[PDB]
């Protein structure tokens, strides 16, 4: 078969056009005025990597947990077009503050049967995912997991249940009503919008065994959201992302080195050394590790009949903490920078295994009920 590559990955692409530069200045100004932040500062929250100390944290406070999807984290902003004050416009924007204008998308207002009324000053936190259906059909979906503002009112200072509560009633409910009767008009939407499937902090097992294997998109871990804390812009020490070791991948520069024998010539059919290199300076690479390859994989690699050396590969750590080939990355000019590699490995060193996480669940459950007393 073909060599595993980035083309195997179902990659969600934002179904919109980049907003013009003059337009984003207005939006950033408009958003900052609404939230009370700095205009060029991303108002979204960022999670911290799940560490060992976070087992105790889950025992002390009420938590929700959801599936962390393979997709794009972006904020959805319902507003009016910066150039056309009478035109309802929806924007998606990521942590790099890149605004995408999405057309033909529409969020109904409750009890308005005219269909002319629309929401403004509404800001959601969610994930853009690509659901795969049989027959090679694709469906873009936006999974809402938090609400920063709804109809001019800032909910950041409220708790999670209230934030998600206002979204469900004011936005999700009318859209559901609308979709039931306007199915034709719904199918033109660039994407569908829904509240994310959530569980109580101790319902981890249910996620692993029932929810995650039934999703129509990919998964790369869990998100733990505290229900006792306000929404925090930037790094939130109470928002935890967990991820198995096998999903903490690194891009390396692969380089093959063949044993130069003293007698005769080189046997190229024999397994060489697989050197993994880290990118530092300009075109300056440094040795970092050897990729472990067994005989069966080496034959498989040769059977690909593609160049192996001098290209970017994504690798993962196995149970023996050996770096293993995952796929080629043709979409990368260079391997990860040493600073990036260090960060990933730190998340692994302070990591918690899936077994330890599960075996700590019942204690987390009983403490949750001792608080409900």
């Amino acid at each position: 078969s073909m060599a595993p590559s980035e083309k195997d990955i179902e990659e969600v692409s934002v179904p919109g056009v980049l907003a013009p530069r003059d337009d984003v200045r207005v939006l950033k100004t408009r958003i900052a005025k609404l939230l009370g932040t700095s205009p060029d500062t991303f108002p979204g929250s960022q999670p911290v990597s799940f560490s060992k100390k976070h087992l105790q944290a889950l025992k002390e406070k009420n938590y929700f947990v959801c599936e962390k999807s393979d997709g794009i984290r972006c904020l959805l902003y319902m507003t009016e077009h910066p150039r056309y004050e009478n035109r309802p416009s929806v924007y998606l924007f990521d942590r790099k503050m890149n605004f995408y204008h999405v057309e033909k998308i529409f969020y109904p207002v409750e009890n308005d049967k005219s269909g002319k009324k629309y929401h403004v000053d509404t800001l959601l936190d969610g994930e853009l995912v690509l659901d795969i259906y049989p027959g090679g059909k694709k469906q873009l979906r936006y999974l809402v997991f938090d609400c920063l503002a709804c109809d001019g009112i800032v909910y950041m200072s409220r708790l999670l249940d209230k934030r998600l509560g206002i979204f469900a009633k004011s936005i999700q409910k009318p859209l559901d009503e609308y979709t039931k009767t306007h199915m034709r008009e719904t199918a033109i939407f660039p994407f569908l919008t829904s509240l994310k499937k959530m569980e109580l902090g101790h319902g981890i097992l249910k996620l692993f065994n029932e929810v995650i294997p039934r999703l129509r998109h990919g998964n790369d871990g869990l998100i733990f959201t505290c229900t006792e804390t306000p929404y925090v812009s930037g790094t939130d020490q109470s928002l935890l992302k967990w991820k198995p070791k096998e999903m903490n991948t690194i891009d390396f520069m692969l380089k093959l080195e063949f044993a130069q024998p003293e007698e005769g010539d080189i046997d190229y059919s024999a397994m060489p050394e697989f050197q993994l290199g880290v990118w530092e300076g300009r075109n300056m690479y440094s040795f970092f590790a050897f990729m472990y390859v067994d005989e069966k994989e080496w034959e498989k690699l040769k059977s690909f009949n593609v160049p192996l050396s001098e290209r970017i590969v994504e690798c993962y750590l196995d149970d023996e903490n050996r770096w293993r080939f995952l796929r080629f990355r043709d979409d990368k000019r260079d391997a990860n920078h040493i600073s990036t590699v260090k960060s990933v490995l730190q998340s692994i060193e302070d990591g918690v295994s899936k077994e330890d996480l599960l075996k700590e669940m019942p204690i987390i459950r009983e403490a949750y009920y001792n608080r409900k007393k």
């Binding site: 929700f64 249940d161 998600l164 509560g165 469900a168 959530m198 109580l200």
Partner: peptide, 8 residues
């Protein structure tokens, strides 16, 4: 005011 709450 509305509130979100799953189980279990």
């Amino acid at each position: 005011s509305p509130s979100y709450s799953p189980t279990s």
